[PDB]
């Protein structure tokens, strides 16, 4: 039918020592098969693949195929949660989705 | 045709004296005709209708039918921009959308 969004980019502030949800959801008018997704971290001096996986189809959950660290977990929802935040976690978190698309979260740990 | 989103709620910080975009977009699978939208402000002690309008259908631009103040403008996309921000502009900005069942997106704005 119809759904609303605050867009594809957001700044999030979060306190050191806690946990934060980094949101990304996607919608499919059509029927998708074998979706590919990847979360990356970027700072001026650093790059990391945080987590990646696939989504077989609209009915099935996302399967995680690779994960950098167990401080990260996955929660159509491909949001991630970053546990036990540190000040070095500040930077840019991007969710890339194939089958071409990306959402961007700027995380500031305070 | 696929589309991603960071969701339906966000916190926004903005500097007094400047302008801020309060985002809300919507997507149509089936389609729509004569959609109704309304933006409200809420604080613990206050309520306002900021702007109201309709979108004739998926091809047409949004049509504004009522606006509280010219500090607000509309910028499919039914985002609004709030100009000449004041500290009292802090609060909850909600975008309500109706398709005849209702949907809404919520911005928490803190002016700093």
Numbering used by the authors:
A (entry chain B): 30 to 104, 112 to 135, 142 to 152
B (entry chain A): 30 to 104, 112 to 136, 141 to 152
From the paper:
Voltage-gated sodium channels are transmembrane proteins responsible for the generation of action potentials in excitable cells and play important roles in the propagation of electrical impulses throughout nerves. They are complexes of a pore-forming α subunit and auxiliary β subunits, designated β1/β1B–β4 (encoded by SCN1B–4B). In addition to the channel modulation, the β subunits function as cell adhesion molecules. In this study, we determined the crystal structures of the mouse and human β4ex proteins containing all three Cys residues, which revealed the formation of a dimer in a parallel arrangement, mediated by the intermolecular disulfide bond and the exchange of the N-terminal segments.
In this study, the human β4ex containing all of the Cys residues was prepared, and its crystal structure was determined in the hexagonal form at 2.2-Å resolution. The human β4ex also assumes the same parallel arrangement as those in the previous and present mouse β4ex crystals. Therefore, it appears that the parallel arrangement of β4 is a conserved natural property. The anti-parallel arrangement was not observed in the cubic and hexagonal crystal forms, probably because PEG fragments were bound to the trans homophilic interface (hexagonal form) and because detergent was used for the crystallization and the C-terminal tag sequence was present (cubic form) (see “Experimental Procedures”). The parallel arrangement of the β4 molecules was mediated, in common, through two types of interactions. First, the β4ex structure forms the intermolecular disulfide bond (the S–S interaction) between the “unpaired” Cys residue (Cys58) in the loop connecting strands B and C. Second, the N-terminal segment Ser30-Val35, which is deleted in another structure of β4ex, is involved in an intermolecular interaction between the two β4ex molecules in the parallel arrangement. This type of interaction is designated hereafter as the N–N interaction. Moreover, in this N–N interaction, the N-terminal segments form hydrogen bonds between their Glu32 and Ser34 with Ser56 and Thr54, respectively, and join the β sheets of the counterparts. As these intermolecular interactions are sophisticated and conserved in the human and mouse β4 structures, we hereafter designate the two β4ex molecules in the parallel arrangement as the parallel dimer.
